[model samples]
Target: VLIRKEVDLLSLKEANAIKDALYKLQNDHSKGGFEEIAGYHGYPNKCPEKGDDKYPCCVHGMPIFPHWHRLHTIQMERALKNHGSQIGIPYWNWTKRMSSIPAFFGDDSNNNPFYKYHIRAVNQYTTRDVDVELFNQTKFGEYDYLYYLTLQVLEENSFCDFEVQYEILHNAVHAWLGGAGKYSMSTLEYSAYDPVFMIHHSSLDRIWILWQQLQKRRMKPYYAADCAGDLMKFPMHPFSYKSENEDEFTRVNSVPNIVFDHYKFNYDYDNMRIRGHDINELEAIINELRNKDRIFAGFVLSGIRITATVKVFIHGTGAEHEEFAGKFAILGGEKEMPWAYERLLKLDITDAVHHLHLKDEEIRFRMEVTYYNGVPVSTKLADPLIVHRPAHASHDILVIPVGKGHELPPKVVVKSGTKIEFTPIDSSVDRAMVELGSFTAMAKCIVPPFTYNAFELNKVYSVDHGDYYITAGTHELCEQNVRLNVHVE
Candidate 1:
């Protein structure tokens, strides 16, 4: 009944279904011009020449960026879900071909209602022309960076920090899709004109829905809007609609996390059942620990996704949960380039049970992830260095190059039947830990293994090629002690 999922790109059935509805909304003049729907978003057209003009158009850079789009996409879905498909509009997961627009929109002109707008996608082909390194980042690399967030910002104290992180990501997606030109989706002024905008936001809502499941303990709320909450009050902008009972839409504007409270609108993500979204397993377990032990939990997150050593201090947790109070390790996942859907990240957190063995514990803790550009915690492993499990889906096994400094142990040139191995440097504490390059830079190898590539550019925190970020360093050639074991069959 309320099951909404990825449009199964290979199937194309859902893609075609979405296309049919999109045309109706775009062309049917009676339903108000396309500009009216798009105008709600502040693009070149939606955004006035100067000054902040309220009312009709949507607002951004504000706390409501994510929430406002959720409301807007719902309105758009409501308009399109009829005639045949009763479910919500399907979305693009950014799991594949990050740059190319779907063929259904461009391959068939007759079906392309957007053809008249002189619309076209710039990065359609894999000519290796566009920046290959930047092409492979997972939205924000945070799409799957859950364990840390669930323990950190998801329930920190208020909605302030959560909204900041959400908006920061919102801008990145638009820029990624739009590339370096005046593409509609890239620029805030004309993004809504592009059809991908709505579908993109649908997935955005899915992200928001999953975020709610992480809260076990109640975070101290702000006193009022963006400022207040008893449980905490999170206020954001509202959506505009024409009706005598317009007051019904009042709630749409504020209570930023209101979507978590109600879902008169129906639909669930495809992975909901698989990832344990329906059962609230993560919440029940975390909260049980908090209530039973009389000690609340906070998460210490560190990964290739972020460059800074973010230390969040919650007002009510024990010092053990204080920043870096506990040791956290993230390893592997960097050997080979990951596919679009390969979001399996590592956050080796210590256990609440053994305090020696690691567990998925999210209470107050210290995080050690830094921009690979920085030299981080260099500690030796106890046993074999742990990494994410094998990717659930099959991979293309493409032949890419791995320069000397960052070679995965076992081999330089790899093939289908080849098996590789990793050797821990030394089990020494406070060692000179090194992360190879930025996400794009590491999109650079055998690097920190975060979302990286050739020409490594995204270095954020440290400028130390030894302990620096892309912004501050000379990016000198760096090397890791990666030895390989060749099994002579």
Candidate 2:
């Protein structure tokens, strides 16, 4: 197992200086003087040989790859070092707690002190009520497993040259963060004011490092190719750099552009290792673990049960249909699913159970339900359920809706400083708003409809901070009371 190193927060001033240099690169590409700087370090303007098929070179085409990034970092660090700042880009050790959600959200870690600040900023900006439909009508949705599969294949087969691979990885992140477009940037600005961004990006850089270690010698072929025609064929192999222009030959890729080397940079890949499993086997393991973690942590512990005495309201009756199906699986240690926790279910109209076990420090619940008609449907929801774990001197109340209903119960009072979460099982209901006295807040959804078969709402309103009546429902006018009490700290 490779030992992972943590980003040095103490050196943040130096790191920030490096970031400033990178910002300059992003804004003014030519200021770094890629040719003069790289050439001085014994780097090449292009790959070794031209058009030999066996000896392709970097910068034959577009410029985007690990080598480029490596050189970029090296140059940035060198620039900063010249200014008397001693710092290196840090790598986060995610493997230390692979199964756990990132600590930036819950735990008080120096690496992520700005988590809450960012969350609040996001909430405030999104509350502006800008027309989301104006920007291409793109709805936030869960990540597609097929896309993830493509990435997995790329990672496994080690296809594509290192440069291309780095571009893929780089582009993947921009895509995950809402793509590189006007709307996405606008969306990110409101929420991106957090320190978590650094750690998250660092984690991404680590993935590239892992890819290098996994592919080994297979990683060398790209730089050996010729780049005479294809500008996009820039070599990504970290071992070499490309020059800015063929004639100038003065330009080069070199040590001034990179921060850490293969040996100097370290991280624990034990959790991400493939463990010799085929794609099918690995996918099975992933599914199994996802299901088990969801059921154990989500359903059994946090799910709430309610008994609705009202008659079932059947909307335009159609033939009953099943939309999705899958089995339950639990992932054990080593990031592999070795066993199943429960059998698959194919039922209609399941209710929520209220009796929960909140003692567990970390829990994740997930369920995949399919609808028969309309469209083939599947939904999965996962969340960490906790009670009084934050050491607050108050009780926390979570009301989970198990069945579809026209009305809900009212808020039951409890101790002050208690946290509460109300989740719904169905996704079709719209205008589902939360009301606490004069302060009424609409719940922002993290998961998309049909993606998880359920709708999750994370609303934090202080009862002690102010007195408010709590209500929730699909319609703004139609309100139901779901009373919850929290003990005072």
Pick by TM-score: which candidate is best? 1
List, residue by residue over 26-110, the lDDT tens digit for candidate 2.
Answer: 2332424322332222222223434433221222113233444444344433433444434443444332213333333324455
| Sliding window of 10 residues with minimal summed lDDT for model 1 | 335-344
What residue runs in model 2 are displaced by over 4 Å at the alpha carbon? Answer: 1-5, 8-63, 92-154, 158-172, 175-205, 217-251, 254-489
Note the Cα lDDT for every prediction shown: 0.38, 0.30
Query: What TM-score, computed on C-alpha atoms, does each candidate reach?
Result: 0.45, 0.29
Residue 355 accuracy (lDDT) in model 2: 23
RMSD for all candidates, in order, please. Answer: 18.2, 22.5
- Candidate 2 structure lDDT: 0.30
Model 1's alpha-carbon lDDT is 0.38
Alpha-carbon RMSD, candidate 1? 18.2
